[PDB]
Design a protein around this nucleic acid. Structure first.
Ligand SMILES: NC[C@@H]1O[C@H](O[C@H]2[C@@H](O)[C@H](O[C@@H]3[C@@H](O)[C@H](N)C[C@H](N)[C@H]3O[C@H]3O[C@H](CO)[C@@H](O)[C@H](O)[C@H]3N)O[C@@H]2CO)[C@H](N)[C@@H](O)[C@@H]1O
Ligand SMILES: NC[C@@H]1O[C@H](O[C@H]2[C@@H](O)[C@H](O[C@@H]3[C@@H](O)[C@H](N)C[C@H](N)[C@H]3O[C@H]3O[C@H](CO)[C@@H](O)[C@H](O)[C@H]3N)O[C@@H]2CO)[C@H](N)[C@@H](O)[C@@H]1O
Ligand SMILES: NC[C@@H]1O[C@H](O[C@H]2[C@@H](O)[C@H](O[C@@H]3[C@@H](O)[C@H](N)C[C@H](N)[C@H]3O[C@H]3O[C@H](CO)[C@@H](O)[C@H](O)[C@H]3N)O[C@@H]2CO)[C@H](N)[C@@H](O)[C@@H]1O
Ligand SMILES: NC[C@@H]1O[C@H](O[C@H]2[C@@H](O)[C@H](O[C@@H]3[C@@H](O)[C@H](N)C[C@H](N)[C@H]3O[C@H]3O[C@H](CO)[C@@H](O)[C@H](O)[C@H]3N)O[C@@H]2CO)[C@H](N)[C@@H](O)[C@@H]1O
Ligand SMILES: NC[C@@H]1O[C@H](O[C@H]2[C@@H](O)[C@H](O[C@@H]3[C@@H](O)[C@H](N)C[C@H](N)[C@H]3O[C@H]3O[C@H](CO)[C@@H](O)[C@H](O)[C@H]3N)O[C@@H]2CO)[C@H](N)[C@@H](O)[C@@H]1O
Ligand SMILES: [Mg+2]
Ligand SMILES: [Mg+2]
Ligand SMILES: [Mg+2]
Ligand SMILES: [Mg+2]
Ligand SMILES: [Mg+2]
Ligand SMILES: [Mg+2]
Ligand SMILES: [Mg+2]
Ligand SMILES: [Mg+2]
Ligand SMILES: [Mg+2]
Ligand SMILES: [Mg+2]
Ligand SMILES: [Mg+2]
Ligand SMILES: [Mg+2]
Ligand SMILES: [Mg+2]
Ligand SMILES: [Mg+2]
Ligand SMILES: [Mg+2]
Ligand SMILES: [Mg+2]
Ligand SMILES: [Mg+2]
Ligand SMILES: [Mg+2]
Ligand SMILES: [Mg+2]
Ligand SMILES: [Mg+2]
Ligand SMILES: [Mg+2]
Ligand SMILES: [Mg+2]
Ligand SMILES: [Mg+2]
Ligand SMILES: [Mg+2]
Ligand SMILES: [Mg+2]
Ligand SMILES: [Mg+2]
Ligand SMILES: [Mg+2]
Ligand SMILES: [Mg+2]
Ligand SMILES: [Mg+2]
Ligand SMILES: [Mg+2]
Ligand SMILES: [Mg+2]
Ligand SMILES: [Mg+2]
Ligand SMILES: [Mg+2]
Ligand SMILES: [Mg+2]
Ligand SMILES: [Mg+2]
Ligand SMILES: [Mg+2]
Ligand SMILES: [Mg+2]
Ligand SMILES: [Mg+2]
Ligand SMILES: [Mg+2]
Ligand SMILES: [Mg+2]
Ligand SMILES: [Mg+2]
Ligand SMILES: [Mg+2]
Ligand SMILES: [Mg+2]
Ligand SMILES: [Mg+2]
Ligand SMILES: [Mg+2]
Ligand SMILES: [Mg+2]
Ligand SMILES: [Mg+2]
Ligand SMILES: [Mg+2]
Ligand SMILES: [Mg+2]
Ligand SMILES: [Mg+2]
Ligand SMILES: [Mg+2]
Ligand SMILES: [Mg+2]
Ligand SMILES: [Mg+2]
Ligand SMILES: [Mg+2]
Ligand SMILES: [Mg+2]
Ligand SMILES: [Mg+2]
Ligand SMILES: [Mg+2]
Ligand SMILES: [Mg+2]
Ligand SMILES: [Mg+2]
Ligand SMILES: [Mg+2]
Ligand SMILES: [Mg+2]
Ligand SMILES: [Mg+2]
Ligand SMILES: [Mg+2]
Ligand SMILES: [Mg+2]
Ligand SMILES: [Mg+2]
Ligand SMILES: [Mg+2]
Ligand SMILES: [Mg+2]
Ligand SMILES: [Mg+2]
Ligand SMILES: [Mg+2]
Ligand SMILES: [Mg+2]
Ligand SMILES: [Mg+2]
Ligand SMILES: [Mg+2]
Ligand SMILES: [Mg+2]
Ligand SMILES: [Mg+2]
Ligand SMILES: [Mg+2]
Ligand SMILES: [Mg+2]
Ligand SMILES: [Mg+2]
Ligand SMILES: [Mg+2]
Ligand SMILES: [Mg+2]
Ligand SMILES: [Mg+2]
Ligand SMILES: [Mg+2]
Ligand SMILES: [Mg+2]
Ligand SMILES: [Mg+2]
Ligand SMILES: [Mg+2]
Ligand SMILES: [Mg+2]
Ligand SMILES: [Mg+2]
Ligand SMILES: [Mg+2]
Ligand SMILES: [Mg+2]
Ligand SMILES: [Mg+2]
Ligand SMILES: [Mg+2]
Ligand SMILES: [Mg+2]
Ligand SMILES: [Mg+2]
Ligand SMILES: [Mg+2]
Ligand SMILES: [Mg+2]
Ligand SMILES: [Mg+2]
Ligand SMILES: [Mg+2]
Ligand SMILES: [Mg+2]
Ligand SMILES: [Mg+2]
Ligand SMILES: [Mg+2]
Ligand SMILES: [Mg+2]
Ligand SMILES: [Mg+2]
Ligand SMILES: [Mg+2]
Ligand SMILES: [Mg+2]
Ligand SMILES: [Mg+2]
Ligand SMILES: [Mg+2]
Ligand SMILES: [Mg+2]
Ligand SMILES: [Mg+2]
Ligand SMILES: [Mg+2]
Ligand SMILES: [Mg+2]
Ligand SMILES: [Mg+2]
Ligand SMILES: [Mg+2]
Ligand SMILES: [Mg+2]
Ligand SMILES: [Mg+2]
Ligand SMILES: [Mg+2]
Ligand SMILES: [Mg+2]
Ligand SMILES: [Mg+2]
Ligand SMILES: [Mg+2]
Ligand SMILES: [Mg+2]
Ligand SMILES: [Mg+2]
Ligand SMILES: [Mg+2]
Ligand SMILES: [Mg+2]
Ligand SMILES: [Mg+2]
Ligand SMILES: [Mg+2]
Ligand SMILES: [Mg+2]
Ligand SMILES: [Mg+2]
Ligand SMILES: [Mg+2]
Ligand SMILES: [Mg+2]
Ligand SMILES: [Mg+2]
Ligand SMILES: [Mg+2]
Ligand SMILES: [Mg+2]
Ligand SMILES: [Mg+2]
Ligand SMILES: [Mg+2]
Ligand SMILES: [Mg+2]
Ligand SMILES: [Mg+2]
Ligand SMILES: [Mg+2]
Ligand SMILES: [Mg+2]
Ligand SMILES: [Mg+2]
Ligand SMILES: [Mg+2]
Ligand SMILES: [Mg+2]
Ligand SMILES: [Mg+2]
Ligand SMILES: [Mg+2]
Ligand SMILES: [Mg+2]
Ligand SMILES: [Mg+2]
Ligand SMILES: [Mg+2]
Ligand SMILES: [Mg+2]
Ligand SMILES: [Mg+2]
Ligand SMILES: [Mg+2]
Ligand SMILES: [Mg+2]
Ligand SMILES: [Mg+2]
Ligand SMILES: [Mg+2]
Ligand SMILES: [Mg+2]
Ligand SMILES: [Mg+2]
Ligand SMILES: [Mg+2]
Ligand SMILES: [Mg+2]
Ligand SMILES: [Mg+2]
Ligand SMILES: [Mg+2]
Ligand SMILES: [Mg+2]
Ligand SMILES: [Mg+2]
Ligand SMILES: [Mg+2]
Ligand SMILES: [Mg+2]
Ligand SMILES: [Mg+2]
Ligand SMILES: [Mg+2]
Ligand SMILES: [Mg+2]
Ligand SMILES: [Mg+2]
Ligand SMILES: [Mg+2]
Ligand SMILES: [Mg+2]
Ligand SMILES: [Mg+2]
Lengths: 119, 206, 146, 123
RNA sequence: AAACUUUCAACAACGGAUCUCUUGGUUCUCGCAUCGAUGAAGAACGCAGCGAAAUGCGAUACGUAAUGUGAAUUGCAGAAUUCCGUGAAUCAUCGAAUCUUUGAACGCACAUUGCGCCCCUUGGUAUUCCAGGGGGCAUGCCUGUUUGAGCGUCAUUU
RNA sequence: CUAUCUAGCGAAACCACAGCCAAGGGAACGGGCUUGGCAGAAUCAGCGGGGAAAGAAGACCCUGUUGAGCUUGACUCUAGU
RNA sequence: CGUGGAGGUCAGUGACGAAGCCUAGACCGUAAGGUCGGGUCGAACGGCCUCUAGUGCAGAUCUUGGUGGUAGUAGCAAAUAUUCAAAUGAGAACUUUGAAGACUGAAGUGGGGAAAGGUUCCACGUCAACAGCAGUUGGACGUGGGUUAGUCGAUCCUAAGAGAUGGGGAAGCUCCGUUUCAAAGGCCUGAAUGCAGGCCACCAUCGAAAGGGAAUCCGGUUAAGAUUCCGGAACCUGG
RNA sequence: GUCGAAUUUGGGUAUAGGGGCGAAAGACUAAUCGAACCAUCUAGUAGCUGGUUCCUGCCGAAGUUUCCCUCAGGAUAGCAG
RNA sequence: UUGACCUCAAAUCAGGUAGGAGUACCCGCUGAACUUAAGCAUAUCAAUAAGCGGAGGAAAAGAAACCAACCGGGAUUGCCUUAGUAACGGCGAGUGAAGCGGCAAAAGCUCAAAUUUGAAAUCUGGUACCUUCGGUGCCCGAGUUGUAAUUUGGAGAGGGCAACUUUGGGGCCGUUCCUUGUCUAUGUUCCUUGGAACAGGACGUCAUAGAGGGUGAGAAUCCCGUGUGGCGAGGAGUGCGGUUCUUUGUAAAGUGCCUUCGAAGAGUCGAGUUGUUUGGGAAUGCAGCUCUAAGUGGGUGGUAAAUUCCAUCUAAAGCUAAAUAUUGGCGAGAGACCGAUAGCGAACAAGUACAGUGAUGGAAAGAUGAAAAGAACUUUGAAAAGAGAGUGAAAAAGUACGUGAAAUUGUUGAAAGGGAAGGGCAUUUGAUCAGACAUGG
């Protein structure tokens, strides 16, 4: 039951804030009835919903902070490439590309010649 | 290598009224005190443990290799051998069976099958259909569950699709006359493979 | 110990030899994969024949000096005597060896001959991609034997 | 035989694969053949069996019996139909596990992507 | 003659040989090249309607998002079974997050759930004192920056 | 208080096979072999003659081109000096 | 002669019963062994020709596992001691209660704590195992309950001692060193916060539940907690 | 035996294996000390004990020679297949 | 008084980086003994184990201060062979490489020392601005104690001269590659046994599919697959062919000829000595201390020295693919392997339960049946259970569960028995088995 990922993404922050609070109100009230009854399997879907609400609220604020940093040279390490320690310190495609002026002319003067031999 | 040798076990020495074999340290578990290393003791190391560098492949002289493949062919001419080797060539017009080279182009099974049956290979075909049986040993779970006889050897010059046509038939195998494997020629080192030749193949032999 | 009448052997196996032991079980797969490694080179390399032209060289000492052998590269004298520069002679696939000077004419002749005669049977494609369809010969040395 | 360097014929991994197959993959191993009628109409031999399919037992001591699929028990590699039940001597009735391959589907419960599957298969 | 003892048989015990099983081991080959201060490896404690393990996870806790898939999961219960459907599932996939207390482990400690300092914000009169919330302060080194020291030292003094 | 008898509970040592002698010869001190004495179910409490009784691959002794603790103008070295 | 596996072959055997096992039953072989019947059994297995080995057991104070005689035997005898009745229970020398007889005799068989254990505490259920007789009982089994602090501890301080830091060794893991051959700071004031005041400056930290130390008592209360809860009366530090 | 001091003792702390510690016994250093405990080198070497797995058929020994830091072992010739 | 400079500090200065894990392979350091020598010290084990520092997907080595002595050869690595050879060795035990030759793979290279000196032409950052692995403009910083171009010995530079040759940067379809989805054959006919047909018989079918697994027993055709082809979706990215641009070029490269010039690495090479190592022997490498070069110089040329020549390379600075390594990691395919005392220790809640203060030590243990149909109900019992009765193909499968051996044990039956028992030959007695019976009714 409970909440749905796409429906939440439309609602505004300040509504989500209140969404949560009455889910916490419910889940709290659940745990009361829970110990007065022969179990209560129902409480699973609301505590999962709280995760979803909180996932979305996170999605927004992260994306929002993603915008505020767009195009800039220095972005929070939270939001960076990840990939690999070893990887992300490898030379950039630019840095590996550089070639000494002596060579760039040698790489022009006599670059590899495609040929063949018939008969 | 590590087998049966992963442990600290020392001997206990004489004087404990216990055999001198190495025995396991510590306590608190049945393993402690038990016999270690050694072939006689459970959980130990096997005597003279098998090595990979055991000599597996065997070298043969090339001329002697061809001498084997040669007689192996000549036996396919002898009616009594091929008969004795367990092949159903009982009737059939003549040995050798040489067949129309059009065979080499047959690309579909139902054709290639009835092609052989009509040239007189039907009886040693049906054989291999009736010889499939569960394997005798534990090789059953070693990826050989089944054991069957040998159908005829269909030998060509060029492969125009006879190979794909007979690749699914139970017991027939196909070979170029340029190669001619002795294993196929004398299965079990048994002379007299029943061999169906194509005229193109047969005229190539010399 | 020492018994009967037998030649004295020397078997160097006191050393933990069973540690460093190489079987080659891979001789099959190290060939099958040695082929596929060459097969797709020539694929990626397109009409070019997998190897440089290699010179004719005398080979040394008092034992193998009788025969003649493929050397490393064509050296310097023969490259200009073939009418082209070093730096270009490597672009058309040819072996250039800057050491090994020429102390022998009969070889120097045959080698420069081996160059022009190579330059003959080739076809060297232009800057562009418009070229005469290029059937690929894989061998070079066996196309220009010695 | 297998011509591919991908498929293996090794008996061990095969039985590992069957028994460790997940629920998604089991659903396909739980395919059932289609009845002479349903074969005609849809031009399709077999489809993964699913719940509410009416069915006909083609094998076993229940052969020639009919009912609707009560549940597909994928955990079990088995299937339950109503009307086919053991009555234990305590008076209770108990569902009898049957195999999809020993069943034939006499009516398909269809929805959109069950339709679109019958179409997605050529035939 | 019994009892007793011994030997044999039958049935019954004791025990798990043997036979047949094999989601395991073992060895050969083939292909690929990716751990970590963006917090790894490893550890601790937790997390399910009913779990002690194994397994999975991290207070969003046997999982949240995304994608596919097309109806189950199943020990009982429960459901919304929300089935021509943005949709079942202990499914596959995984590109988005969460990720307690730790650990090279970074304010200082650490047989302690011990103890400082800085910044923002909320409540208690509140610049100060107490409390809640949020973010912070390791080392060596490089490049840069800002601020300094030295009759090491060149000019200017006026 | 034990032992002893009973209800209940219930081990261990050891074990080639076993268990009456005399002599004989015998690896020169036999439960077994040879010749004699003999020889009758099933058993309980005691006992310390035998079982060359049990305990532990003799420590004494010798052997081993097997050690170790130790000593010294043995052989060969060495920190320090 | 026999065993595991391998190529070949009998189109060999078999759910109408393979293999195994049991047979004071049969036959063959000098023998290793082979063959058959009967029983029990449940899914595989054999003959011949070859190949190949982790291929044949009575011992090794062999290894592991199982089992005997010993044997219903040695034993269940230290710590003065038990008895009558009831209740409960299928069942009582052993449980509960009553009574009688006794003991430890406060340097205790009393009343608390430290280390250590870790729920053993308490209550209800409950006796297969465990309590070397017994068990209706238990420190067992099952299910639950339970440990409340400004003042009692920890926390703070320093002890023997340990240990970073400039540094100096060492190939290095690392060693030395604790004020040393170091530019080692952090207070109170005014002008909401920087400059102007200004003193002062050998020195991380860890190290005591028995050392040092801020400060609580009585009465009541639970099945099980109390200098902690409640009622009343106080005190100490910090605002 | 000693029992008001070279007394008994808790806890904290220090010294570690050719090392410690010793009012000295080769004592003690976790039931381990004339060199701890743990793993590895290690399946250490053994001229020395012990064991060494089916049947039948034929042939059939030696304890002597010489050399050996050789005397419980080898080489060597002899006997044997 | 004010402004720089050198050097040296500080900051919770702005941006970063190192640590740890892993360790099969890889580069180094350090470093044994057991052992062999039938003793033992050199030697051997071994330039090994243990200990330490540093990497990658490979590492390393590499464009020769090489090998040779030939008609010479020509970076490196690996295979084959040199070769159990040369040599080392109480010349004992033992040790032991190299040059050539065949093959695998092949790939070459750049700095330092030169005045741009008619122009620091070089570069880090900050910053706005965009087309963001970056691009421009501006600005602080670096730097003349040397940033750029140019040159690397195979050269090559300056001049002098004389003609011919040659180009750049973007992306827009398709291919290849990685992720990844999906389509693509043929009996469930008859009979018989059985609980179950997957069995045997009958009649068929498909096969570029008769690998394998699943399903109530030996299943090509019941299911998943297998074989052959076909169609999507998302990714890299410059290789392969195809697009059309831009105009790189008031740049760059190639090549001819004359004459002059041609910088080439020091507490290094080399040496002495010490130690160690090596097959390296009057000294193979390595390092300590001491000495310390030259520039037609220097190193090597495997017997030390003087002398005379000859041969061949250019140290003391640097980068690089492939062939090569791989008891680790990830993903696969296999075997004349092992079959629960085997095979890894672990087929299982196995590095677990348990032991130790600690480092460490470290097990046992798979199988009811097709399916729980897991024995309703009656009955004796305090109860655990027993007895009926049910399920099942079977209970001679009942969660002590497939088959159920031996030791050992209970009952029943048979026989024997005066201080063991068992064995050989023979026979009485009993029990028990047999082979031999068809020729006229
Ligand atoms: N087959 C029994 C063997 O017992 C061995 O283990 C046993 C031994 O280690 C040890 O047995 C000792 C024995 O070593 C020593 N030499 C004599 C001693 N009397 C024995 O004792 C053992 O056996 C006796 C006799 O049955 C029993 O009465 C006794 O209870 C038992 N502990 O006690 C263990 C348990 O009996 C091994 N597990 C294995 O070799 C094998 O299982
Ligand atoms: N004689 C009629 C023909 O038999 C042919 O084939 C015969 C067999 O080969 C086939 O039976 C199967 C077969 O389907 C499959 N592809 C192979 C399998 N081994 C065969 O199995 C057969 O042989 C085994 C022994 O091997 C025997 O037990 C039994 O006869 C049978 N099960 O079925 C037939 C029975 O003998 C075809 N079915 C067809 O051409 C036609 O029916
Ligand atoms: N100061 C160093 C920096 O710390 C940063 O990390 C900051 C936080 O993310 C980190 O927070 C830690 C957290 O890691 C951890 N899992 C939970 C913990 N409570 C937090 O701890 C922080 O606050 C506590 C308060 O009691 C302090 O005791 C602790 O020293 C401090 N690190 O503590 C830092 C702030 O004190 C970054 N990891 C990095 O840039 C760098 O290492
Ligand atoms: N010494 C006479 C000859 O000089 C020649 O000198 C070379 C160069 O100096 C000469 O000059 C080339 C010129 O060819 C070409 N077409 C134009 C190019 N800019 C020049 O290039 C040269 O000169 C520039 C200055 O202009 C310098 O930076 C530098 O020396 C070089 N790049 O081109 C020659 C190419 O090899 C060669 N070294 C050789 O032929 C011979 O020695
Ligand atoms: N007695 C009535 C009920 O029996 C039930 O139990 C039934 C079974 O589980 C139990 O089975 C027992 C078994 O437990 C035990 N291990 C022994 C035996 N294998 C079985 O025995 C049973 O089956 C046999 C065979 O037909 C009958 O002869 C016998 O009477 C019967 N008790 O026997 C019972 C049937 O008589 C439950 N225990 C309970 O509901 C109640 O006691
Ligand atoms: Mg083992
Ligand atoms: Mg003994
Ligand atoms: Mg066909
Ligand atoms: Mg087998
Ligand atoms: Mg078998
Ligand atoms: Mg297997
Ligand atoms: Mg198999
Ligand atoms: Mg090549
Ligand atoms: Mg697959
Ligand atoms: Mg395998
Ligand atoms: Mg009922
Ligand atoms: Mg099933
Ligand atoms: Mg859809
Ligand atoms: Mg459509
Ligand atoms: Mg079975
Ligand atoms: Mg509950
Ligand atoms: Mg789970
Ligand atoms: Mg349900
Ligand atoms: Mg249900
Ligand atoms: Mg999943
Ligand atoms: Mg995830
Ligand atoms: Mg974390
Ligand atoms: Mg942390
Ligand atoms: Mg910390
Ligand atoms: Mg905070
Ligand atoms: Mg007595
Ligand atoms: Mg008694
Ligand atoms: Mg006792
Ligand atoms: Mg005992
Ligand atoms: Mg005793
Ligand atoms: Mg006398
Ligand atoms: Mg006598
Ligand atoms: Mg006497
Ligand atoms: Mg006597
Ligand atoms: Mg005796
Ligand atoms: Mg006798
Ligand atoms: Mg006699
Ligand atoms: Mg006499
Ligand atoms: Mg006596
Ligand atoms: Mg005795
Ligand atoms: Mg004793
Ligand atoms: Mg003793
Ligand atoms: Mg002795
Ligand atoms: Mg002894
Ligand atoms: Mg003694
Ligand atoms: Mg002596
Ligand atoms: Mg001697
Ligand atoms: Mg000694
Ligand atoms: Mg065999
Ligand atoms: Mg085997
Ligand atoms: Mg076979
Ligand atoms: Mg066979
Ligand atoms: Mg049959
Ligand atoms: Mg068998
Ligand atoms: Mg018999
Ligand atoms: Mg029978
Ligand atoms: Mg039986
Ligand atoms: Mg049988
Ligand atoms: Mg079965
Ligand atoms: Mg079966
Ligand atoms: Mg063996
Ligand atoms: Mg055996
Ligand atoms: Mg035995
Ligand atoms: Mg024995
Ligand atoms: Mg016993
Ligand atoms: Mg007895
Ligand atoms: Mg008793
Ligand atoms: Mg008694
Ligand atoms: Mg006693
Ligand atoms: Mg008493
Ligand atoms: Mg009473
Ligand atoms: Mg009592
Ligand atoms: Mg008294
Ligand atoms: Mg007192
Ligand atoms: Mg108390
Ligand atoms: Mg209690
Ligand atoms: Mg107890
Ligand atoms: Mg008791
Ligand atoms: Mg009892
Ligand atoms: Mg206090
Ligand atoms: Mg403190
Ligand atoms: Mg101090
Ligand atoms: Mg220190
Ligand atoms: Mg100092
Ligand atoms: Mg300030
Ligand atoms: Mg105190
Ligand atoms: Mg109390
Ligand atoms: Mg109060
Ligand atoms: Mg005295
Ligand atoms: Mg006195
Ligand atoms: Mg040590
Ligand atoms: Mg010593
Ligand atoms: Mg010391
Ligand atoms: Mg003393
Ligand atoms: Mg003494
Ligand atoms: Mg001990
Ligand atoms: Mg001790
Ligand atoms: Mg000693
Ligand atoms: Mg110790
Ligand atoms: Mg210990
Ligand atoms: Mg051994
Ligand atoms: Mg060794
Ligand atoms: Mg030896
Ligand atoms: Mg001796
Ligand atoms: Mg001598
Ligand atoms: Mg002897
Ligand atoms: Mg900063
Ligand atoms: Mg590291
Ligand atoms: Mg390392
Ligand atoms: Mg020796
Ligand atoms: Mg020796
Ligand atoms: Mg010695
Ligand atoms: Mg050495
Ligand atoms: Mg090492
Ligand atoms: Mg890496
Ligand atoms: Mg590679
Ligand atoms: Mg490299
Ligand atoms: Mg060079
Ligand atoms: Mg070379
Ligand atoms: Mg030497
Ligand atoms: Mg000598
Ligand atoms: Mg020698
Ligand atoms: Mg050596
Ligand atoms: Mg060497
Ligand atoms: Mg810039
Ligand atoms: Mg910039
Ligand atoms: Mg040109
Ligand atoms: Mg049928
Ligand atoms: Mg099957
Ligand atoms: Mg059939
Ligand atoms: Mg199959
Ligand atoms: Mg199959
Ligand atoms: Mg199919
Ligand atoms: Mg299909
Ligand atoms: Mg397919
Ligand atoms: Mg140089
Ligand atoms: Mg060294
Ligand atoms: Mg030297
Ligand atoms: Mg390099
Ligand atoms: Mg490279
Ligand atoms: Mg391996
Ligand atoms: Mg490893
Ligand atoms: Mg393969
Ligand atoms: Mg077993
Ligand atoms: Mg095992
Ligand atoms: Mg077992
Ligand atoms: Mg076994
Ligand atoms: Mg085995
Ligand atoms: Mg084990
Ligand atoms: Mg356990
Ligand atoms: Mg241990
Ligand atoms: Mg079992
Ligand atoms: Mg009743
Ligand atoms: Mg009752
Ligand atoms: Mg019954
Ligand atoms: Mg039932
Ligand atoms: Mg029935
Ligand atoms: Mg039956
Ligand atoms: Mg049965
Ligand atoms: Mg059964
Ligand atoms: Mg049951
Ligand atoms: Mg049970
Ligand atoms: Mg049992
Ligand atoms: Mg059973
Ligand atoms: Mg079974
Ligand atoms: Mg039995
Ligand atoms: Mg008597």
């Amino acid at each position: 039951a409970g909440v749905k990922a796409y429906e939440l993404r439309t609602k505004s922050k300040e509504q989500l804030a209140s969404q949560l609070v009455d889910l916490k109100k419910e889940l709290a009230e659940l745990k009361v009835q829970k110990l007065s009854r022969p179990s209560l399997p129902k409480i699973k879907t609301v505590r999962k919903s709280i995760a979803c609400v909180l996932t979305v609220i996170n999605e927004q604020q992260r994306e929002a902070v993603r915008q505020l940093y767009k195009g800039k040279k220095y972005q929070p390490k939270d939001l960076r490439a990840k990939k690999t320690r070893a990887l992300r310190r490898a030379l950039t495609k630019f840095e590996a590309s550089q070639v000494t002026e002596k060579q760039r002319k040698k790489q022009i003067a006599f670059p590899q010649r495609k040929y063949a031999i018939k008969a | 290598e590590k087998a049966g040798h992963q442990t600290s076990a020392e001997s206990w020495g004489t004087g404990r009224a216990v055999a001198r074999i190495p025995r396991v340290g510590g306590g608190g578990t049945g393993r402690s005190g038990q016999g270690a290393f050694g072939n006689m003791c459970r959980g130990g190391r096997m005597f003279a443990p098998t090595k990979t560098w055991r000599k597996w492949n065997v070298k043969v002289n090339h001329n002697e290799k061809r001498y084997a493949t040669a007689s192996a062919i000549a036996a396919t001419a002898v009616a009594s051998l091929v008969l004795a080797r367990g092949h159903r060539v009982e009737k059939i017009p003549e040995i050798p069976l040489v067949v129309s080279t059009d065979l080499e182009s047959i690309q579909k099974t139902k054709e290639a099958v009835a092609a052989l049956k009509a040239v007189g290979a039907h009886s040693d075909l049906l054989k291999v259909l009736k010889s499939k049986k569960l394997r005798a040993g534990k090789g059953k779970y070693r990826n050989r569950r089944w054991t069957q006889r040998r159908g005829p050897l269909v030998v060509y010059a060029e492969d125009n699709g006879i190979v794909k046509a007979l690749r699914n038939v139970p017991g027939v195998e196909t070979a170029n006359v340029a190669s001619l494997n002795l294993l196929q020629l004398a299965p079990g080192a048994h002379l007299g493979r029943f061999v169906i030749w194509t005229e193109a193949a047969f005229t190539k032999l010399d | 110990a020492i018994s009967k009448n037998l030649p004295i052997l020397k078997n160097h196996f006191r050393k933990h030899w069973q540690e460093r032991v190489k079987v080659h079980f891979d001789q099959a797969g190290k060939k099958v994969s040695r082929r596929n490694a060459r097969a797709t080179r020539a694929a990626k390399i397109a009409p070019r024949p997998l190897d440089l032209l290699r010179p004719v060289v005398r080979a040394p000492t008092v034992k193998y000096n009788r025969k003649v052998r493929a050397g490393r590269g064509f050296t310097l004298a023969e490259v200009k005597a073939a009418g082209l520069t070093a730096a270009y002679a490597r672009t058309i696939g040819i072996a250039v060896d800057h050491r090994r000077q020429n102390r022998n004419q009969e070889i120097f002749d045959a080698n420069v001959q081996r160059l022009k005669e190579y330059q003959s049977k080739i076809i060297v494609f232009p800057r562009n991609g418009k070229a005469p369809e290029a059937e690929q010969v894989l061998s070079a040395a066996a196309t220009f034997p010695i | 035989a297998k011509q591919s360097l991908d498929v293996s014929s090794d008996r061990r991994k095969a039985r590992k694969a069957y028994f460790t197959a997940p629920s998604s993959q089991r659903r396909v191993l739980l395919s059932a053949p289609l009845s002479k009628e349903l074969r005609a109409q849809y031009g399709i031999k077999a489809l993964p069996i699913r719940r509410d399919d009416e069915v006909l037992v083609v094998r076993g001591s229940k052969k020639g019996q009919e009912g609707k699929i009560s549940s597909v028990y994928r955990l079990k590699f088995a299937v339950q139909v109503d009307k086919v039940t053991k009555e234990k001597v305590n008076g209770a009735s108990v569902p009898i596990n049957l195999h999809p391959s020993k069943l034939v589907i006499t009516k398909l419960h269809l929805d959109k992507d069950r339709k679109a599957l019958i179409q997605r298969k050529g035939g």
